[PDB]
Structure 1
Amino acid sequence: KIEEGKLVIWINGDKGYNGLAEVGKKFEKDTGIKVTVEHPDKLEEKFPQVAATGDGPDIIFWAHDRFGGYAQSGLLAEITPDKAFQDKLYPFTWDAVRYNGKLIAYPIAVEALSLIYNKDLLPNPPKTWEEIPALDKELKAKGKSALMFNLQEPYFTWPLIAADGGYAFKYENGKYDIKDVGVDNAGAKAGLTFLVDLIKNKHMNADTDYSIAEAAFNKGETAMTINGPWAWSNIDTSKVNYGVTVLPTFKGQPSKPFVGVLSAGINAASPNKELAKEFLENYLLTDEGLEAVNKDKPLGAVALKSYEEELAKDPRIAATMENAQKGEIMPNIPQMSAFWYAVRTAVINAASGRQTVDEALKDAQTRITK
């Protein structure tokens, strides 16, 4: 049960116990109220179940998926936006955490992706994606590879196919139409035509991965890579010539990847809403609190300018913050996740020579319109 003098917090999968235990325990010492952290594993699974019993967590931390869950289902108490923190954070993230004219979460952390390049190999970063594959040919002479990507993953397939107009969705006036989409056109067929070009030219290996690119930078074997929140692994500039910039354009369309914001909400069932909401907005969302968690393990970034500027001193984040501000908050709805996989199959079938563009591309759009 939940009782005044103690509260339960569930943390996003991106941290287990440690960070929240740190900030929670310190808060416990400050207010004298017991702070109990639980593991993300149960977080998603139990959240809806414990709500049915009306006893469990006092506050819930997630990224996207929960936002709809607890908001629509009325599992959370309604919160209000803070003008002071609004200035301190970012307007779009408060829009990310707002539902039906009332706020339903606070922005905890920001994740975004960017294009990373070595100034040691490349004298100037690419303005368009068209440069990548031709470049791959040039520096190949030095035994290097210019751009590293996962074709067999949905992450690459979409921004390749969509960029030339093969969009898996129609979006208009705040409405999606899965039946009037841009993959059943010639433009998407153009996507596979190009996509296979460089991978058929063996510009990457089947085992090639982003982590390999991170290692490759250490020796200077790979000029550029695609990375984001994962860049903490091994992306940084010290005593070296490395540079970073958000995704370039391809066929007149930006590769700018979608932006993710961590959202934390107040459980409707919590008698502790007042102190639970207070520390969340005031203690977690401050240079001290979000620092305490990031100090334990690289979280990627925060919405809070105070620490954001400090962490942005790392090349890996600085670019991603540009995409974060200039990008879009997890806008692409549940449907697009399936569409990414539908088109993912398309590029496999095209690359492997198992299907033509006509066959594979039609199958991809058929699944999307299915």
Structure 2
Amino acid sequence: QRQLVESGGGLVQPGGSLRLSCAASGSILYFNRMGWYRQAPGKQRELVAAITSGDSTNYADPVKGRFTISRDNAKNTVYLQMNSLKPEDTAVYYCNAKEKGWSFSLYDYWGQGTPVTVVKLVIWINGDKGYNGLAEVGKKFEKDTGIKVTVEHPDKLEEKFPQVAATGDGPDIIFWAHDRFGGYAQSGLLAEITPDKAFQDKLYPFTWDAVRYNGKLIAYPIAVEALSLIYNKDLLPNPPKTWEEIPALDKELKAKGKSALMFNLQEPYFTWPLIAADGNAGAKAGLTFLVDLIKNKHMNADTDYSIAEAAFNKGETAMTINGPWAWSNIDTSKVNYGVTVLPTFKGQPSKPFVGVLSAGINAASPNKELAKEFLENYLLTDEGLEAVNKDKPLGAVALKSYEEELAKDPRIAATMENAQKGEIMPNIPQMSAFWYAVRTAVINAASGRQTVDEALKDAQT
């Protein structure tokens, strides 16, 4: 009898290629039509290509331009050269042949089927982090498996993820501080994390608590993040221990063509430590001080991450407020820097919010088990976290094995100092609305629109 046998089905990276081949146990000359049909999980049959005895080749609009149906009557084989592959292609590919009998009737013949998988691992992480290093981990993953690991860093990913991931595809794995994850969890945008005891035991038990919402693990903890006072040791050997002595220092420095302190005033995460130093009466005190700095022309009105960073690295400002991630760019520059305790306000310390960098799996992802493999066996390893850390520092890693190395770093000590003086952010769904309320409040008071008393009024609502 006549039997069709397909081959060439495997795993590939989008943009890659695959040659399917279907050999018959009889001459293709006898066939009228030969063609390729595909079936994806839970879907109807979809013709992709066909070739008639008359040498005419037809294709479906999705594959048109990308796929070519070929035939070799010597080898008694029909081919499908699939170039520039996409995730929509992923399906079981079947070979079909039709034969007119001697009489009026016809015969349809089918094959076993050959599986084609187009898989890409996509990761969303912020641009201020070590995406290049994260890619080096991803490159080792592809060597040991065959899956592509692209690393993306889009602007406003914290508020682009819940919109895109809900409707569209978005990323497989999302990287952000733990505070944003409760809102994703409530909305149903994250898969439940199920790590075995042995993996679970590799990380500090306090770190796991930050990535828990209603008794379910919603992410993998990576590292603890806290803002510290970054200062130029040459321009300022004995930096301010108090916030209230910065105006004096600024007067001194402005005479020599230099600023005292430049940091990101737009993002409320940077201004919150000063605001929360005393506490309400504490928020009113802390903000009024911040307002007086801009009013006394000590700080610029629209001071953002880039002009603050650049100014410090250039050697224009004596101080800056930033996280572990910012250190590598300073090292690149020729600035003898120091990381220390944040200045105190009204005697009491400035309480910076503490973030736990965490990796979560998108609920609407087909690569949930592949991402778990990447996160556990490749990223959350000594070797894996090292790679990320040499690009842009992670801070105090969640890995137990890294304690000695963390403790040997003076900047980590300063980070932990500030983290103890601060507090971990609750993961709750209301954090988004909270942060927005503070973002507006600080900008309005900074520019000169709303009063300090009226800012806390609108923010408490």
The residue aligned with 1:162 is: 276
> Residues 264 and 150 of structure 1: is their aligned pair in 2 closer, same or farther, counting only changes over 3 Å?
closer
Instruction: Map Cα deviations across residues 78-116 of structure 1 (whole Å, 9 max, x no partner).
Output: 444566656654333211223333433212344331111
SS in 2 for 1:117: strand
Instruction: Please say if residues 14 and 299 of structure 1, whose CA atoms lie closer than 8 Å, have aligned partners that are also in contact.
Output: no
TM-aligned CA distance change 1:319 to 1:10, over 3 Å: same
Contact conserved, 2:353 with 2:425, CA < 8 A, in 1? Answer: yes
Greater share of strand? 2
Distance 1:9 1:198 in 2: 40
Do residues 147 (structure 1) and 242 (structure 2) align? no
Say if 1:144 and 1:223, in contact at 8 Å, map to a contact too: yes
RCO higher in structure (CA 8 A, sep ≥6): 1
User: Displacement, 1:128?
Assistant: 2.2
Query: 2-side partners of 1:343 and 1:325: how far apart?
Result: 23
Instruction: Report the count of equivalent residues.
Output: 339
2:145 is aligned, of 23, 26, 31, to 31
Cα separation, 2, equivalents of 1:35 and 1:344? 34
Q: Deviation string for 1:101-137 (max 9, x for gaps)? A: 3433212344331111222233323322222223323
SS state of the match for residue 99, structure 1? Answer: coil
Gap regions ≥5 residues in structure 2? 1-119
1:275-334 Cα distance to aligned partner (Å, 9 max, x none):
642442122111222333455566666433556865887766553344456643332755
Aligned to 2:185: 71
Taking only the aligned residue pairs, the percentage that are identical comes to 100
CA distance in 2: counterparts of 1:338 and 1:86, whole angstroms: 32
Q: Which has the larger helix fraction?
A: 1
Does residue 13 of the first structure (1) align with residue 13 of the second (2)?
Answer: no
Consecutive unaligned residues of structure 1, counting only runs of 5 or more, are 1-5, 164-184, 366-370
Q: 1:245 to 1:18 in 2, by over 3 A?
A: closer
- Alignment partners' CA distance in 2, 1:212 and 1:310: 32
What whole-Å deviation, never above 9, does each CA across 1:324-349 have from its counterpart, x for those lacking one?
A: 56643332755455455545555666
Equivalent of 1:284 in 379, 384, 389: 379
Cα–Cα, structure 1 residues 37 and 200, in superposed 2: closer, same or farther, change >3 Å?
A: closer
Which shows bigger deviation, 21-30 or 278-287? 21-30
The structural deviation recorded for 1:31 is: 3.7
Report deviation, 1:69.
5.1
Q: Which structure has the bigger radius of gyration?
A: 2
Tell me, yes or no, if the aligned pair for 1:63 and 1:260 is still in contact at 8 Å: yes
The 1:236/1:306 distance shift into structure 2, 3 A limit, reads: farther
Alpha-carbon distance in structure 2 between the residues aligned to 1:130 and 1:81: 48
Aligned-partner Cα distance in 2 for 1:346–1:267: 32
* TM-score, length basis structure 2: 0.56
Report the more deviating stretch, 256-265 or 330-339. Answer: 330-339
Larger mean CA deviation between 112-121 and 301-310 belongs to: 301-310
Is 1:193–2:193 an aligned residue pair? Answer: no
- RMSD across aligned C-alpha pairs, in angstroms? 4.6
CA contact 2:124–2:173 (8 Å) conserved in 1: yes
Equivalent pair of 2:324/2:395 in contact (CA under 8 Å): yes
> 1:182-220, CA deviations, whole angstroms, 9 ceiling, x for partnerless residues?
xxx455444454333332221123354454444444564
Query: Matches of 2:128 and 2:223 in 1, distance apart?
Result: 11
3-state SS, counterpart of residue 360 of structure 1? helix
Instruction: Give yes or no for contact 2:261–2:319 (8 Å, CA) kept in 1.
Output: yes
Question: Does the 8 Å contact 1:210/1:226 carry over to 2?
Answer: no
Cα shift at 1:227:
1.4
Task: State how far apart, in whole Å, the 2-side matches of 1:357 and 1:74 are.
Answer: 37
Deviation string, structure 1 residues 134-188 (Cα, Å, up to 9, x no partner): 332344444433222444553455433333xxxxxxxxxxxxxxxxxxxxx4554
The whole-number CA distance in structure 2 between the counterparts of 1:42 and 1:140 is 35
Mapped contact 1:189–1:357 kept (Cα < 8 A) = yes
Deviation at 1:228, TM superposition (A): 1.7
Quick one: structure 1 residues 359 and 272, their matched pair in 2 at CA, closer, same or farther if it must change by over 3 Å?
Answer: closer
Change (3 A) 1:208 1:84: same
